[PDB]
Scaffold this motif. Structure first.
Motif, PDB file in Angstrom:
ATOM      1  N   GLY A 154      28.048 -19.138  16.053  1.00 35.80           N
ATOM      2  CA  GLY A 154      26.795 -18.937  16.737  1.00 35.80           C
ATOM      3  C   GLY A 154      26.747 -17.587  17.368  1.00 35.80           C
ATOM      4  N   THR A 155      25.880 -17.449  18.355  1.00 37.36           N
ATOM      5  CA  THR A 155      25.656 -16.217  18.985  1.00 37.36           C
ATOM      6  C   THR A 155      25.986 -16.375  20.457  1.00 37.36           C
ATOM      7  N   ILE A 156      26.709 -15.406  21.019  1.00 42.28           N
ATOM      8  CA  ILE A 156      27.018 -15.347  22.424  1.00 42.28           C
ATOM      9  C   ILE A 156      26.370 -14.140  23.054  1.00 42.28           C
ATOM     10  N   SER A 157      25.408 -14.425  23.936  1.00 45.84           N
ATOM     11  CA  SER A 157      24.598 -13.405  24.567  1.00 45.84           C
ATOM     12  C   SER A 157      25.383 -12.931  25.775  1.00 45.84           C
ATOM     13  N   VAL A 158      26.330 -11.992  25.511  1.00 51.71           N
ATOM     14  CA  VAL A 158      27.294 -11.659  26.543  1.00 51.71           C
ATOM     15  C   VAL A 158      26.704 -11.143  27.816  1.00 51.71           C
ATOM     16  N   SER A 159      25.707 -10.274  27.697  1.00 51.82           N
ATOM     17  CA  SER A 159      25.091  -9.678  28.867  1.00 51.82           C
ATOM     18  C   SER A 159      24.435 -10.755  29.779  1.00 51.82           C
ATOM     19  N   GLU A 160      23.890 -11.797  29.189  1.00 53.22           N
ATOM     20  CA  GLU A 160      23.347 -12.930  29.977  1.00 53.22           C
ATOM     21  C   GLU A 160      24.444 -13.617  30.842  1.00 53.22           C
ATOM     22  N   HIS A 161      25.632 -13.877  30.286  1.00 54.21           N
ATOM     23  CA  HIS A 161      26.760 -14.369  31.110  1.00 54.21           C
ATOM     24  C   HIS A 161      27.093 -13.403  32.189  1.00 54.21           C
ATOM     25  N   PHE A 162      27.127 -12.120  31.855  1.00 49.17           N
ATOM     26  CA  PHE A 162      27.541 -11.141  32.817  1.00 49.17           C
ATOM     27  C   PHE A 162      26.572 -11.219  34.020  1.00 49.17           C
ATOM     28  N   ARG A 163      25.259 -11.213  33.748  1.00 46.56           N
ATOM     29  CA  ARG A 163      24.227 -11.303  34.812  1.00 46.56           C
ATOM     30  C   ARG A 163      24.344 -12.591  35.643  1.00 46.56           C
ATOM     31  N   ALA A 164      24.593 -13.698  34.973  1.00 43.88           N
ATOM     32  CA  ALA A 164      24.793 -14.937  35.663  1.00 43.88           C
ATOM     33  C   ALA A 164      25.976 -14.802  36.638  1.00 43.88           C
ATOM     34  N   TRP A 165      27.100 -14.208  36.193  1.00 41.45           N
ATOM     35  CA  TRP A 165      28.278 -14.061  37.061  1.00 41.45           C
ATOM     36  C   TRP A 165      27.912 -13.184  38.201  1.00 41.45           C
ATOM     37  N   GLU A 166      27.242 -12.087  37.947  1.00 39.64           N
ATOM     38  CA  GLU A 166      26.961 -11.193  39.056  1.00 39.64           C
ATOM     39  C   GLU A 166      25.976 -11.854  40.067  1.00 39.64           C
ATOM     40  N   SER A 167      25.109 -12.750  39.598  1.00 42.78           N
ATOM     41  CA  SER A 167      24.103 -13.355  40.493  1.00 42.78           C
ATOM     42  C   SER A 167      24.788 -14.374  41.410  1.00 42.78           C
ATOM     43  N   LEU A 168      25.955 -14.895  40.993  1.00 45.55           N
ATOM     44  CA  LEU A 168      26.789 -15.754  41.820  1.00 45.55           C
ATOM     45  C   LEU A 168      27.781 -14.991  42.674  1.00 45.55           C
ATOM     46  N   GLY A 169      27.610 -13.701  42.833  1.00 45.96           N
ATOM     47  CA  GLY A 169      28.525 -12.928  43.649  1.00 45.96           C
ATOM     48  C   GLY A 169      29.844 -12.444  42.985  1.00 45.96           C
ATOM     49  N   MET A 170      30.040 -12.718  41.692  1.00 41.98           N
ATOM     50  CA  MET A 170      31.208 -12.282  40.905  1.00 41.98           C
ATOM     51  C   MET A 170      30.939 -10.850  40.403  1.00 41.98           C
ATOM     52  N   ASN A 171      31.325  -9.892  41.231  1.00 42.18           N
ATOM     53  CA  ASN A 171      31.113  -8.460  41.038  1.00 42.18           C
ATOM     54  C   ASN A 171      31.978  -7.928  39.845  1.00 42.18           C
ATOM     55  N   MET A 172      31.353  -7.161  38.964  1.00 43.16           N
ATOM     56  CA  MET A 172      31.986  -6.624  37.758  1.00 43.16           C
ATOM     57  C   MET A 172      32.130  -5.154  37.982  1.00 43.16           C
ATOM     58  N   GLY A 173      33.242  -4.604  37.505  1.00 46.76           N
ATOM     59  CA  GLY A 173      33.549  -3.178  37.555  1.00 46.76           C
ATOM     60  C   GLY A 173      33.099  -2.466  36.291  1.00 46.76           C
ATOM     61  N   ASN A 174      33.584  -1.265  36.070  1.00 46.79           N
ATOM     62  CA  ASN A 174      33.340  -0.529  34.866  1.00 46.79           C
ATOM     63  C   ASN A 174      34.068  -1.204  33.718  1.00 46.79           C
ATOM     64  N   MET A 175      33.416  -1.269  32.564  1.00 41.58           N
ATOM     65  CA  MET A 175      33.932  -1.982  31.414  1.00 41.58           C
ATOM     66  C   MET A 175      35.086  -1.309  30.770  1.00 41.58           C
ATOM     67  N   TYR A 176      36.048  -2.133  30.364  1.00 39.19           N
ATOM     68  CA  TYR A 176      37.197  -1.682  29.595  1.00 39.19           C
ATOM     69  C   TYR A 176      37.173  -2.279  28.201  1.00 39.19           C
ATOM     70  N   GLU A 177      36.646  -3.493  28.023  1.00 36.61           N
ATOM     71  CA  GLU A 177      36.675  -4.124  26.727  1.00 36.61           C
ATOM     72  C   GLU A 177      35.782  -5.367  26.664  1.00 36.61           C
ATOM     73  N   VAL A 178      35.225  -5.618  25.485  1.00 40.97           N
ATOM     74  CA  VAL A 178      34.680  -6.909  25.114  1.00 40.97           C
ATOM     75  C   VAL A 178      35.016  -7.168  23.649  1.00 40.97           C
ATOM     76  N   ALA A 179      35.536  -8.366  23.392  1.00 39.47           N
ATOM     77  CA  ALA A 179      36.038  -8.698  22.087  1.00 39.47           C
ATOM     78  C   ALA A 179      36.122 -10.199  21.860  1.00 39.47           C
ATOM     79  N   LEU A 180      35.786 -10.612  20.670  1.00 39.25           N
ATOM     80  CA  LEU A 180      36.031 -11.964  20.265  1.00 39.25           C
ATOM     81  C   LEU A 180      37.546 -12.126  20.070  1.00 39.25           C
ATOM     82  N   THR A 181      38.060 -13.222  20.618  1.00 38.15           N
ATOM     83  CA  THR A 181      39.517 -13.443  20.872  1.00 38.15           C
ATOM     84  C   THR A 181      39.963 -14.879  20.572  1.00 38.15           C
ATOM     85  N   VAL A 182      41.158 -15.018  20.017  1.00 38.80           N
ATOM     86  CA  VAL A 182      41.859 -16.281  19.865  1.00 38.80           C
ATOM     87  C   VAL A 182      43.084 -16.163  20.770  1.00 38.80           C
TER      88      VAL A 182
END
Ligand SMILES: [Ca+2]
Ligand SMILES: [Ca+2]
Ligand SMILES: [Ca+2]
Ligand SMILES: [Ca+2]
Lengths: 324, 327
Positions: A154-182
């Motif tokens: 399927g599709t994972i709308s990563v930026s939507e998760h990111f916004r949800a986390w930040e709206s709950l007070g989970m502050n994000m820094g400068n990006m280092y990586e995003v990757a599909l992972t096992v």
């Protein structure tokens, strides 16, 4: 196959094999974002393909992120099929988990939910103490979205998760990586990531700017009404320019223009004074030439359309520029 | 779908739709190097996914090139399924054609042949007069390898064709582009390029790994010193501690495989520098000898200083280095 810790770039995707001591792993890189993986009796192993960043920009500054993927996923034990990455300042390890093996992570009490991508995800914040990280052995937060039920495509709308986390007070820094992972933990398993496409800048409003409304520069630039209302650029230095407010970091530029004749007319795109590409008009017939995927950053910046390779055999006619 | 001239980068691949006036075309971009295309009643149309370059390097300087591909290819009239690209200084449009529609290009008299990729190709040099190019309307040479019969999947060893051309006096300038391409001329058609992988720097002809023992390197910083456990090698203890050696890079890209360890359960990090620039960081997560590889490093051909240096020490670990291997 890769069987020891390694990083690189394989068909455009930043890949990484990481494990600690104990057991074994194997990763095979295939085209695009794809790869297969196998592991036995590990302590901790991660296999991933995505994008690494230079630690200078937030996810907002980079642009929209979305991953479309599919995997055959056969863990035997604790394992995750997840989007994964890091931020710095602050140092955060993050996960958007779509499937798992014997245990649904990450424990504790949810801080929130998000319904997105046809599913539901509980959101969590944990702490890792003196653990391996991109900054060495350290203590850092983990941010999580974890699907309420398993899927493997399927599709994972990563930026939507990111916004949800930040709206709950989970502050994000400068990006280092995003990757599909096992990920595997005290387990064995295999997976075949047969699809994995990470899109930055995808659609989350076109602006059209008539050439004749822009500022003229150089020796001869002048308005025209044939073959359209617009402008002509006759000589080297002839250009039209305007300041534009870029509210996202990436754009396509579509210029409607033509040569005055059968010789090929070239017009350079400049953004903030820097050449970003050339528009080609091969004909006397109005055409729309698009330069896609220009990463220019958010900000008010000068767009120039300028002739630099005139030699007296053609002129460029410009109707309008559209930015999307 | 794309239906007008356009350039971009899609899933890592530099794509282009180009047509002159007449008829119509449509291109759909899929993952990796893949795309589909359709056209009707064109004059000239090209659809491609590959790599564009900055016009400063020859193919030698960039590295070995090879493309693995497959396509469903249904031309109706004149058409090529081919590797395509350009050099500059001199300006040259080039082709390695594996299949075609009604007419096998390019006419005239072969200058040579090359057997490669299980196939045979005749080689030709033609001239285009006042035609469209990357430098405007111009007059330029075209270099061609054309397969003696049709094929729509396999591997094209691009660099071997380029050397064949140059051995015949067809000189190549700095690279502008290499790409898998579907061309139509005065025709209609469709194609699905379901596989297309361009590899730069892949192995060519039993090139060997070089292994350099850390203990034979030049030592620098305040405490660097030799060790014999857990292997023969060196220890780097404080920031600025490093080992370094000139290496003679005969191709432009390398993997670097450092066998090392932390002294303890804390993560040791050792920076790779080439030619005075930071090129990456080797991680040793624990006290057990491991081989950490940084792959796909483009340093350029030349004699360049390789350094292995500690910059993030805080007194909680030391780095132990056995050897570095370059491939
Ligand atoms: Ca002119
Ligand atoms: Ca206009
Ligand atoms: Ca130390
Ligand atoms: Ca040694």
């Amino acid at each position: 196959a890769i069987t020891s810790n390694e990083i690189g770039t394989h068909d455009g995707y930043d890949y990484e094999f990481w494990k600690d001591s104990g057991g074994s792993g194997s990763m095979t890189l295939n085209s695009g974002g794809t790869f297969s993986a196998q592991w036995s009796n590990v302590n901790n192993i991660l296999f991933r393909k995505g994008k690494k960043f230079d630690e200078t920009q937030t996810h907002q500054q980079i642009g929209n992120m979305s991953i479309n993927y599919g995997a055959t996923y056969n863990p035997n034990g604790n394992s995750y099929l997840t989007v994964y990455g890091w931020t710095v300042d602050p140092l955060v390890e993050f996960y958007i988990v779509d499937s798992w093996g014997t245990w649904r992570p990450p424990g504790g009490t949810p801080k929130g939910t998000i319904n997105v991508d046809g599913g539901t995800y509980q959101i969590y914040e944990t702490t890792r103490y003196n653990q391996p990280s991109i900054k060495g052995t350290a203590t850092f937060q983990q941010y999580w979205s974890v699907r309420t039920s398993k899927r493997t495509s399927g599709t994972i709308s990563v930026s939507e998760h990111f916004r949800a986390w930040e709206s709950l007070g989970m502050n994000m820094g400068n990006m280092y990586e995003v990757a599909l992972t096992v990920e595997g933990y005290q387990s064995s398993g295999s997976a075949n990531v047969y699809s994995n496409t990470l899109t930055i800048g995808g659609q989350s409003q076109a602006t059209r700017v008539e050439a004749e409304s822009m500022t003229k520069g150089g020796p001869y630039t002048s308005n025209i009404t044939s073959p359209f209302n617009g402008v002509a650029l006759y000589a080297n230095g002839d250009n039209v320019s305007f300041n534009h407010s870029f509210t996202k970091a990436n754009s396509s530029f579509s210029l409607r223009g033509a040569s005055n004749n059968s010789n090929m007319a070239r017009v350079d795109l400049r953004i903030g004074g820097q050449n970003r590409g050339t528009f080609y008009f091969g004909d006397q017939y109005p055409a729309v030439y698009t330069i896609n995927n220009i990463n220019h950053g958010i900000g008010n910046q000068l767009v120039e359309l300028i002739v630099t390779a005139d030699d007296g055999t053609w002129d460029a006619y410009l109707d309008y520029l559209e930015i999307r």
